[PDB]
Amino acid sequence: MESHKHYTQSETEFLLSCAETDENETLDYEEFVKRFHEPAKDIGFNVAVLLTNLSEHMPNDTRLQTFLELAESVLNYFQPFLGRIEIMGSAKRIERVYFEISESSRTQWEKPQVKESKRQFIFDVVNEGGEKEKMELFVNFCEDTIFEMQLAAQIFWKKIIAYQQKLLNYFARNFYNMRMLALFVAFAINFILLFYKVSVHYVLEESSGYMEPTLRILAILHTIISFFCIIGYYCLKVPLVIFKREKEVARKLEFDGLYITEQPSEDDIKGQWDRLVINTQSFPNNYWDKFVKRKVMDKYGEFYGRDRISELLGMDKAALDFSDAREKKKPKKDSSLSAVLNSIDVKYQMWKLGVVFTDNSFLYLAWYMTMSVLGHYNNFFFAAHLLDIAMGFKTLRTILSSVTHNGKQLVLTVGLLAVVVYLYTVVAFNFFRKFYNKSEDGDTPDMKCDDMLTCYMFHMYVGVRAGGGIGDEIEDPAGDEYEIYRIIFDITFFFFVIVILLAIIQGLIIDAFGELRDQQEQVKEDMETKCFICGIGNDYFDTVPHGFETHTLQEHNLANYLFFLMYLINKDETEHTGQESYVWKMYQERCWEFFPAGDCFRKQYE
Amino acid sequence: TMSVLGHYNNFFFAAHLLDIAMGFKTLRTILSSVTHNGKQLVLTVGLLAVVVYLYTVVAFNFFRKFYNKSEDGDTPDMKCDDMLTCYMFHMYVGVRAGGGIGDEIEDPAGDEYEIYRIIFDITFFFFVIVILLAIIQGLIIDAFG
Amino acid sequence: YFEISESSRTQWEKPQVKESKRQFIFDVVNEGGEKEKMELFVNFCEDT
Ligand SMILES: [Ca+2]
Ligand SMILES: [Zn+2]
């Protein structure tokens, strides 16, 4: 401690004065730091927040300058522990509030799935969401993310359950690695299936042993890995989506009265599926708000009937359960002795199944599993697993979303194409029917136009795909009886169908791909040259070196805002400061006017 | 090294004609364009290979009696009677026929697989010819632009 | 105000200096923005 260049002799002797000397000349540094560091850390963080507030408010004071050099000598330890937010409220001015950030919160934020959720939120809030619901979506994302961080941190009856929990946690932790291994095994199976031949009798001929049994080995391994992937997903991401839906339906019940006063429509299947379990037993299982039932009861009980509310919301004959629990409640209760199973609520379980079977990703993994099962029957069904790279990469997802994007325009252009092909078909069927003789020697003429449906199909199957119309494959007229009419027909066909409509669908898909790529680049450039919270711009902060960088990484950090919301939630109110209590009241009343809309600390002060 | 190799075989001096591409400006622009959207080009080519492979396996299972590339024979030159040969024939003819793959193999002309064969061929000419090949074309043209 | 040498003018009129100048202009207006523009310009002046 005297040679590590971080202590002078006075400090070294002051620190040896704190020794224990347990009669053998030995100190236990373990208990030393377990006893002498935690309160020191807490009060040091408090005084560091005080000094940082004083610094960021009153600059350029030599006495405060030495105070600040000592302050930063201390802050070199509390830099990753203090966070700052710019609130706008209760004073008509920007206020820099400070708070504590937990190492656990930092780790759970550094977790991968949290980063994936963050990038997805950024993308779908800059693409679709504007500025009226931007803060709404951001606060919803913060809530979903703190729930996801809690889940990631969480990641005879006492012998099987404690092991199945560990197994599910391991699967949820290695879900992504399971996906990569599944992709690699699928590529291997497809390579082996490429090394193939036929004799009516399928055999893998191109190799000499060591390749037939490994195919079945990799097939059963891929099936096992697909089952492991779906099991890990069901315990890693299903909690998040069911929590989102529970929060949505609970807030619709509380604020809007979706199933009390403004009953949903008949086409919205989501409304009906939520009405299915607005009255279940354990309705808020993941929203951590087990009192939305009593809240909506107290809100809509004196107008629509308290008994009616209690029967439509579940928990019948328990309108006095609150008073019974407030006055001489029961201490506890054993689970059961004869009812080991069926304790769960079948209604809520069916609701969970119905919400996971329309997740658009659980469905993808289910299709993956069924394709593996079918590949066990016929090995060539493992080729469908090669499409996993299209969903794994970015620009491939862009191509797929492009071919899906202009869906209605594509379908209607294809319909118009079919209609012009049908019109050209009927004119060729009436007039130019002696020219559709597809034979070289015969002598049996293979007339493709001597039937309406066959002629229409020959048209839609040759004339659309000949690249030069339809006349370049059937016989040339070469006779002054229908020459001019036949040529005008063929040139009009090659004009409207080949170089116009086919080109229209081509350009439709190409422009959809270009638009999707261009929106992605615009989202990237907006995140790179514009602030998310305030959105003042980049040239304003491009005055001091790294100005915009420090502004977006210190003052208006989305991670800092999320950590501040987590701190307010875990703050144990009646201990909030003025600004913290104000922000908490705004968050409870769902107003979000405390975000800096068109101002920042630099724009407000010097 | 190309000059040294041209001393061995004189035709290696043809590689020196590419010096104008680096000497001029718009030619360097064309080369930097074909290099620019590199990852997007590679991944679009991979997706192209994948759809060609899927169309290959469906043609290999169902429409294998139509790949008879002969005029007189009498020995049938079946190009689809092997998986790798069928995939290669696909990636080598159906991508570059300009009108799909059905415009070079025999017409079904029979009410047994006619509708399925035509839907297969029109979907091929749609996805591979006038969509994905067009996507790579537009990628390079837009990089140049 | 300052003095400019005829030697400096000639070496600036040299061709490779003009090539380096145009390359710097191109790759400082294309990739470089305004935060590192003066950095790149001073580095170019030293190289030149
Ligand atoms: Ca208080
Ligand atoms: Zn900002």
Side-chain angles (χ1 to χ4, degrees), chain A residues 1-319 325 331 337-606, chain B, chain C:
Chain A
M1 69 160 176
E2 78 184 349
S3 82
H4 281 40
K5 278 185 195 27
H6 288 168
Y7 278 143
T8 189
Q9 291 294 23
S10 64
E11 318 176 6
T12 56
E13 309 192 90
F14 183 82
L15 266 301
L16 49 105
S17 301
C18 298
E20 282 71 20
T21 78
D22 43 81
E23 71 259 54
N24 55 47
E25 296 310 305
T26 307
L27 64 94
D28 192 74
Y29 64 91
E30 276 234 276
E31 56 86 20
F32 197 94
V33 291
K34 290 154 169 29
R35 180 169 51 177
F36 285 85
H37 176 61
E38 287 77 0
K41 180 176 59 180
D42 306 338
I43 287 89
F45 166 77
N46 282 273
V47 72
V49 170
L50 169 61
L51 291 160
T52 315
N53 195 320
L54 282 161
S55 171
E56 303 202 313
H57 271 248
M58 289 197 54
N60 310 326
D61 294 313
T62 354
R63 44 178 188 269
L64 197 50
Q65 278 301 326
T66 116
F67 282 144
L68 261 44
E69 81 183 13
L70 306 173
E72 61 84 21
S73 73
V74 186
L75 297 160
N76 283 13
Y77 181 81
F78 291 111
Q79 271 299 329
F81 280 98
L82 63 92
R84 57 199 76 179
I85 312 298
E86 297 204 11
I87 304 297
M88 209 296 297
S90 76
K92 283 317 161 116
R93 286 176 285 99
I94 293 291
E95 317 185 73
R96 302 177 66 100
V97 309
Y98 301 80
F99 67 99
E100 182 189 5
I101 301 180
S102 256
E103 196 263 330
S104 43
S105 90
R106 278 291 176 82
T107 301
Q108 305 320 117
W109 177 260
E110 291 316 278
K111 285 306 190 64
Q113 55 268 15
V114 173
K115 310 162 64 60
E116 186 173 289
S117 143
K118 170 187 59 181
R119 72 181 59 172
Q120 291 182 184
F121 154 73
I122 290 178
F123 294 160
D124 64 11
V125 80
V126 182
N127 275 332
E128 292 79 10
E131 272 87 0
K132 186 170 320 187
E133 192 179 1
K134 181 161 57 64
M135 298 313 179
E136 170 63 3
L137 295 184
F138 175 56
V139 171
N140 290 17
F141 156 74
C142 289
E143 299 172 6
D144 310 329
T145 312
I146 63 182
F147 176 81
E148 191 169 7
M149 287 165 55
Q150 290 180 0
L151 170 62
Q154 181 198 333
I155 289 181
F156 174 77
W157 207 257
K158 65 179 72 66
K159 303 185 302 179
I160 302 312
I161 303 313
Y163 184 78
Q164 71 101 44
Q165 185 70 20
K166 293 184 56 180
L167 193 64
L168 300 200
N169 289 140
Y170 170 80
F171 285 164
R173 184 167 63 258
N174 297 87
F175 167 71
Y176 287 145
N177 306 330
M178 282 295 187
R179 289 292 291 172
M180 297 301 301
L181 192 56
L183 179 55
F184 288 156
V185 173
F187 262 69
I189 281 139
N190 276 268
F191 181 79
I192 297 181
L193 290 175
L194 192 70
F195 279 170
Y196 181 74
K197 213 177 187 304
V198 74
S199 325
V200 56
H201 189 62
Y202 291 161
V203 331
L204 193 147
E205 179 22 36
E206 200 146 62
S207 294
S208 46
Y210 204 68
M211 200 160 292
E212 270 284 324
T214 190
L215 190 150
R216 310 173 298 105
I217 288 182
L218 291 183
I220 190 64
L221 177 57
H222 182 288
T223 305
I224 292 175
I225 291 176
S226 307
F227 188 71
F228 283 173
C229 290
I230 186 60
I231 286 302
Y233 181 87
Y234 189 79
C235 53
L236 176 62
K237 305 292 299 185
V238 179
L240 185 55
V241 56
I242 70 181
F243 154 75
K244 291 182 185 182
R245 203 197 187 96
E246 283 182 353
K247 168 171 62 64
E248 285 207 41
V249 60
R251 288 175 173 171
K252 299 166 175 61
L253 269 184
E254 169 186 348
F255 293 87
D256 303 45
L258 187 68
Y259 305 105
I260 311 298
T261 76
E262 68 164 6
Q263 277 282 346
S265 66
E266 58 161 359
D267 57 318
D268 191 8
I269 187 61
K270 168 182 303 302
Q272 278 72 238
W273 202 247
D274 293 356
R275 181 194 305 171
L276 181 63
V277 303
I278 50 178
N279 61 86
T280 186
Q281 174 62 218
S282 54
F283 157 67
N285 190 23
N286 288 117
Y287 186 42
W288 66 73
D289 193 8
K290 277 78 180 180
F291 313 95
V292 53
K293 290 177 165 297
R294 291 301 303 178
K295 195 172 305 179
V296 60
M297 279 182 181
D298 305 0
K299 189 171 179 59
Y300 295 99
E302 294 82 19
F303 205 95
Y304 294 89
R306 183 182 180 182
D307 48 0
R308 195 188 71 92
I309 294 301
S310 175
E311 59 83 64
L312 178 145
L313 191 69
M315 186 182 37
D316 262 320
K317 75 192 101 168
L337 198 158
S338 168
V340 178
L341 66 128
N342 262 316
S343 179
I344 55 180
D345 42 357
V346 179
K347 178 177 290 184
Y348 183 74
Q349 293 305 125
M350 289 296 184
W351 176 79
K352 187 174 182 177
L353 295 188
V355 72
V356 304
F357 273 92
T358 54
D359 200 16
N360 209 320
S361 176
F362 185 92
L363 282 178
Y364 175 80
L365 301 186
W367 164 87
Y368 185 72
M369 183 66 174
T370 69
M371 277 302 177
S372 197
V373 167
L374 294 178
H376 264 310
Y377 295 159
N378 182 19
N379 286 318
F380 275 140
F381 276 98
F382 277 91
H385 299 324
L386 268 181
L387 293 171
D388 196 16
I389 61 178
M391 296 297 184
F393 285 91
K394 185 172 186 175
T395 176
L396 300 180
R397 282 203 305 265
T398 302
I399 298 180
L400 303 189
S401 305
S402 86
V403 71
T404 302
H405 193 253
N406 283 323
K408 225 197 178 57
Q409 302 186 9
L410 192 131
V411 167
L412 292 176
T413 317
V414 166
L416 184 62
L417 175 67
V419 163
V420 259
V421 165
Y422 177 81
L423 299 186
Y424 280 104
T425 282
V426 299
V427 204
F429 177 82
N430 286 119
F431 304 151
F432 315 93
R433 86 159 62 83
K434 77 177 187 67
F435 295 95
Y436 289 85
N437 206 32
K438 296 295 294 182
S439 307
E440 287 87 4
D441 35 0
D443 197 335
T444 65
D446 191 7
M447 291 302 184
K448 292 286 184 56
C449 174
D450 177 64
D451 181 9
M452 165 53 58
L453 187 58
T454 305
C455 180
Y456 172 70
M457 226 50 82
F458 176 79
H459 273 246
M460 197 74 177
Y461 157 73
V462 179
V464 185
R465 307 187 300 111
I470 202 179
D472 58 349
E473 51 88 19
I474 57 172
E475 56 174 17
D476 185 313
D480 30 312
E481 68 284 330
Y482 283 155
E483 184 100 18
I484 182 71
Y485 192 13
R486 194 262 208 283
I487 64 169
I488 203 75
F489 178 93
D490 277 298
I491 67 179
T492 50
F493 187 92
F494 170 72
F495 198 65
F496 289 159
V497 173
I498 298 303
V499 299
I500 288 171
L501 274 174
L502 189 84
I504 281 170
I505 320 178
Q506 188 179 59
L508 267 164
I509 295 199
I510 294 169
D511 284 309
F513 177 64
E515 200 169 74
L516 265 50
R517 210 180 62 216
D518 284 326
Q519 287 179 5
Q520 293 181 0
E521 278 96 66
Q522 177 185 340
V523 165
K524 185 183 310 303
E525 181 266 353
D526 269 332
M527 283 298 105
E528 258 331 51
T529 81
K530 186 182 177 182
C531 185
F532 186 85
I533 301 295
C534 64
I536 295 302
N538 190 29
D539 51 353
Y540 190 90
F541 307 97
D542 262 5
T543 60
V544 308
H546 310 75
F548 191 80
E549 188 156 359
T550 66
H551 167 74
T552 56
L553 274 60
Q554 306 289 342
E555 311 180 15
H556 282 179
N557 200 333
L558 312 186
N560 280 4
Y561 274 71
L562 186 135
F563 293 149
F564 176 66
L565 284 187
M566 190 172 190
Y567 186 63
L568 285 190
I569 288 192
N570 278 3
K571 191 44 192 177
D572 190 307
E573 171 205 335
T574 63
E575 292 177 355
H576 294 190
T577 61
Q579 305 155 326
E580 292 187 16
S581 159
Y582 173 77
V583 174
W584 178 258
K585 182 180 61 180
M586 301 211 86
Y587 163 79
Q588 289 278 36
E589 68 185 2
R590 313 288 295 183
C591 174
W592 315 286
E593 279 295 76
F594 61 94
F595 288 99
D599 232 274
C600 82
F601 197 74
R602 300 178 54 177
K603 290 187 60 59
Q604 187 70 215
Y605 299 139
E606 302 90 21
Chain B
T1 69
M2 277 302 177
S3 197
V4 167
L5 294 178
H7 264 310
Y8 295 159
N9 182 19
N10 286 318
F11 275 140
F12 276 98
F13 277 91
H16 299 324
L17 268 181
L18 293 171
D19 196 16
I20 61 178
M22 296 297 184
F24 285 91
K25 185 172 186 175
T26 176
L27 300 180
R28 282 203 305 265
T29 302
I30 298 180
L31 303 189
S32 305
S33 86
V34 71
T35 302
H36 193 253
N37 283 323
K39 225 197 178 57
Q40 302 186 9
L41 192 131
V42 167
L43 292 176
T44 317
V45 166
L47 184 62
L48 175 67
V50 163
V51 259
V52 165
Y53 177 81
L54 299 186
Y55 280 104
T56 282
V57 299
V58 204
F60 177 82
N61 286 120
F62 304 151
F63 315 93
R64 86 159 62 83
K65 77 177 187 67
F66 295 95
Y67 289 85
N68 206 32
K69 296 295 294 182
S70 307
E71 287 87 4
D72 35 0
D74 197 335
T75 65
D77 191 7
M78 291 302 184
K79 292 286 184 57
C80 173
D81 177 64
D82 181 9
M83 165 53 57
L84 187 58
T85 305
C86 180
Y87 172 70
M88 226 50 82
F89 176 79
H90 273 245
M91 197 74 177
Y92 157 73
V93 179
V95 185
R96 307 187 300 111
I101 202 179
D103 58 349
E104 51 88 19
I105 57 172
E106 56 174 17
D107 185 313
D111 30 312
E112 69 284 330
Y113 283 155
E114 184 100 18
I115 182 71
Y116 192 13
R117 194 262 208 282
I118 64 169
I119 203 75
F120 178 93
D121 277 298
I122 67 179
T123 50
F124 187 92
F125 170 72
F126 198 66
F127 289 159
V128 173
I129 298 303
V130 299
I131 288 171
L132 274 174
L133 189 84
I135 281 170
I136 320 178
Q137 181 179 58
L139 267 164
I140 295 199
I141 294 169
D142 284 309
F144 177 64
Chain C
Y1 301 80
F2 67 99
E3 182 189 5
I4 301 180
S5 256
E6 196 263 330
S7 43
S8 90
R9 278 291 176 82
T10 301
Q11 304 320 117
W12 177 260
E13 291 316 278
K14 285 306 190 64
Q16 55 268 15
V17 173
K18 310 162 64 60
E19 186 173 289
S20 143
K21 170 187 59 181
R22 72 181 59 172
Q23 291 182 184
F24 154 73
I25 290 178
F26 294 160
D27 64 11
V28 80
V29 182
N30 275 332
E31 292 79 10
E34 272 87 0
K35 186 170 320 187
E36 193 179 1
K37 181 161 57 64
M38 298 313 179
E39 170 63 3
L40 295 184
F41 176 56
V42 171
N43 290 17
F44 156 74
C45 289
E46 299 172 6
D47 310 329
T48 312

mmCIF file of all heavy atoms in Angstrom, chain C residues 2-15:
data_model
loop_
_atom_site.group_PDB
_atom_site.id
_atom_site.type_symbol
_atom_site.label_atom_id
_atom_site.label_comp_id
_atom_site.label_asym_id
_atom_site.label_seq_id
_atom_site.Cartn_x
_atom_site.Cartn_y
_atom_site.Cartn_z
ATOM 1 N N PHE C 2 1.544 37.484 -43.442
ATOM 2 C CA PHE C 2 2.805 36.757 -43.381
ATOM 3 C C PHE C 2 3.405 36.685 -44.779
ATOM 4 O O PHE C 2 2.791 37.100 -45.766
ATOM 5 C CB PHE C 2 2.605 35.361 -42.787
ATOM 6 C CG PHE C 2 1.784 34.451 -43.649
ATOM 7 C CD1 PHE C 2 2.393 33.515 -44.465
ATOM 8 C CD2 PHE C 2 0.403 34.535 -43.649
ATOM 9 C CE1 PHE C 2 1.641 32.680 -45.261
ATOM 10 C CE2 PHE C 2 -0.351 33.704 -44.445
ATOM 11 C CZ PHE C 2 0.267 32.774 -45.250
ATOM 12 N N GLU C 3 4.616 36.137 -44.854
ATOM 13 C CA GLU C 3 5.368 36.026 -46.094
ATOM 14 C C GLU C 3 5.230 34.625 -46.674
ATOM 15 O O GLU C 3 5.217 33.634 -45.939
ATOM 16 C CB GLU C 3 6.847 36.346 -45.860
ATOM 17 C CG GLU C 3 7.705 36.292 -47.115
ATOM 18 C CD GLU C 3 9.187 36.401 -46.817
ATOM 19 O OE1 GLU C 3 9.552 36.422 -45.623
ATOM 20 O OE2 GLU C 3 9.985 36.469 -47.776
ATOM 21 N N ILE C 4 5.134 34.552 -47.999
ATOM 22 C CA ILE C 4 5.031 33.294 -48.725
ATOM 23 C C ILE C 4 6.253 33.163 -49.622
ATOM 24 O O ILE C 4 6.584 34.090 -50.368
ATOM 25 C CB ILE C 4 3.735 33.222 -49.548
ATOM 26 C CG1 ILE C 4 2.527 33.369 -48.627
ATOM 27 C CG2 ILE C 4 3.664 31.914 -50.305
ATOM 28 C CD1 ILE C 4 1.207 33.305 -49.343
ATOM 29 N N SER C 5 6.920 32.018 -49.544
ATOM 30 C CA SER C 5 8.138 31.800 -50.307
ATOM 31 C C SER C 5 7.824 31.320 -51.719
ATOM 32 O O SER C 5 6.862 30.580 -51.950
ATOM 33 C CB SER C 5 9.031 30.781 -49.601
ATOM 34 O OG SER C 5 10.112 31.424 -48.951
ATOM 35 N N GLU C 6 8.655 31.755 -52.672
ATOM 36 C CA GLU C 6 8.538 31.246 -54.035
ATOM 37 C C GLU C 6 8.763 29.743 -54.078
ATOM 38 O O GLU C 6 8.129 29.035 -54.872
ATOM 39 C CB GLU C 6 9.529 31.952 -54.959
ATOM 40 C CG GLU C 6 9.211 31.765 -56.438
ATOM 41 C CD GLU C 6 10.006 30.639 -57.075
ATOM 42 O OE1 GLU C 6 11.136 30.373 -56.620
ATOM 43 O OE2 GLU C 6 9.491 30.013 -58.026
ATOM 44 N N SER C 7 9.660 29.235 -53.231
ATOM 45 C CA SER C 7 9.844 27.793 -53.125
ATOM 46 C C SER C 7 8.564 27.111 -52.662
ATOM 47 O O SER C 7 8.183 26.063 -53.195
ATOM 48 C CB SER C 7 10.996 27.478 -52.172
ATOM 49 O OG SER C 7 10.933 28.293 -51.015
ATOM 50 N N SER C 8 7.887 27.692 -51.669
ATOM 51 C CA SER C 8 6.631 27.116 -51.202
ATOM 52 C C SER C 8 5.577 27.143 -52.300
ATOM 53 O O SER C 8 4.830 26.176 -52.476
ATOM 54 C CB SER C 8 6.134 27.858 -49.962
ATOM 55 O OG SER C 8 5.305 28.948 -50.320
ATOM 56 N N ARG C 9 5.514 28.240 -53.058
ATOM 57 C CA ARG C 9 4.555 28.323 -54.156
ATOM 58 C C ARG C 9 4.826 27.258 -55.212
ATOM 59 O O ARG C 9 3.896 26.608 -55.703
ATOM 60 C CB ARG C 9 4.592 29.715 -54.783
ATOM 61 C CG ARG C 9 3.774 30.746 -54.032
ATOM 62 C CD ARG C 9 2.291 30.453 -54.153
ATOM 63 N NE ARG C 9 1.485 31.383 -53.369
ATOM 64 C CZ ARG C 9 1.134 32.596 -53.780
ATOM 65 N NH1 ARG C 9 1.521 33.033 -54.971
ATOM 66 N NH2 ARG C 9 0.398 33.375 -53.000
ATOM 67 N N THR C 10 6.097 27.059 -55.568
ATOM 68 C CA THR C 10 6.433 26.044 -56.563
ATOM 69 C C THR C 10 6.095 24.643 -56.064
ATOM 70 O O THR C 10 5.467 23.853 -56.784
ATOM 71 C CB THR C 10 7.914 26.139 -56.926
ATOM 72 O OG1 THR C 10 8.195 27.443 -57.446
ATOM 73 C CG2 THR C 10 8.276 25.093 -57.968
ATOM 74 N N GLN C 11 6.500 24.316 -54.834
ATOM 75 C CA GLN C 11 6.196 22.997 -54.295
ATOM 76 C C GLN C 11 4.695 22.779 -54.160
ATOM 77 O O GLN C 11 4.227 21.639 -54.252
ATOM 78 C CB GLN C 11 6.889 22.799 -52.947
ATOM 79 C CG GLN C 11 8.395 23.009 -52.978
ATOM 80 C CD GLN C 11 9.047 22.435 -54.220
ATOM 81 O OE1 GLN C 11 9.626 23.165 -55.024
ATOM 82 N NE2 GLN C 11 8.965 21.120 -54.378
ATOM 83 N N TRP C 12 3.925 23.849 -53.950
ATOM 84 C CA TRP C 12 2.473 23.713 -53.937
ATOM 85 C C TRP C 12 1.932 23.496 -55.344
ATOM 86 O O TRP C 12 0.944 22.777 -55.532
ATOM 87 C CB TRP C 12 1.839 24.947 -53.300
ATOM 88 C CG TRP C 12 0.345 24.927 -53.297
ATOM 89 C CD1 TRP C 12 -0.483 25.566 -54.169
ATOM 90 C CD2 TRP C 12 -0.503 24.239 -52.369
ATOM 91 N NE1 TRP C 12 -1.793 25.318 -53.847
ATOM 92 C CE2 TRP C 12 -1.832 24.505 -52.745
ATOM 93 C CE3 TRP C 12 -0.266 23.424 -51.260
ATOM 94 C CZ2 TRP C 12 -2.921 23.985 -52.053
ATOM 95 C CZ3 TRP C 12 -1.349 22.909 -50.574
ATOM 96 C CH2 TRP C 12 -2.659 23.191 -50.972
ATOM 97 N N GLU C 13 2.565 24.111 -56.344
ATOM 98 C CA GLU C 13 2.150 23.906 -57.727
ATOM 99 C C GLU C 13 2.567 22.544 -58.264
ATOM 100 O O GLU C 13 2.098 22.148 -59.336
ATOM 101 C CB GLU C 13 2.718 25.009 -58.621
ATOM 102 C CG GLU C 13 2.106 26.380 -58.385
ATOM 103 C CD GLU C 13 0.597 26.332 -58.254
ATOM 104 O OE1 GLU C 13 -0.090 26.311 -59.297
ATOM 105 O OE2 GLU C 13 0.098 26.314 -57.110
ATOM 106 N N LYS C 14 3.446 21.831 -57.558
ATOM 107 C CA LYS C 14 3.833 20.476 -57.942
ATOM 108 C C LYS C 14 2.604 19.576 -58.071
ATOM 109 O O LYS C 14 1.614 19.772 -57.354
ATOM 110 C CB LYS C 14 4.817 19.892 -56.928
ATOM 111 C CG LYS C 14 6.223 20.455 -57.038
ATOM 112 C CD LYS C 14 6.761 20.317 -58.451
ATOM 113 C CE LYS C 14 8.243 20.641 -58.509
ATOM 114 N NZ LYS C 14 9.048 19.672 -57.716
ATOM 115 N N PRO C 15 2.630 18.583 -58.966
ATOM 116 C CA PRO C 15 1.401 17.806 -59.228
ATOM 117 C C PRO C 15 0.947 16.940 -58.063
ATOM 118 O O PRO C 15 -0.247 16.938 -57.725
ATOM 119 C CB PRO C 15 1.783 16.960 -60.452
ATOM 120 C CG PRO C 15 3.003 17.613 -61.029
ATOM 121 C CD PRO C 15 3.728 18.199 -59.866
#
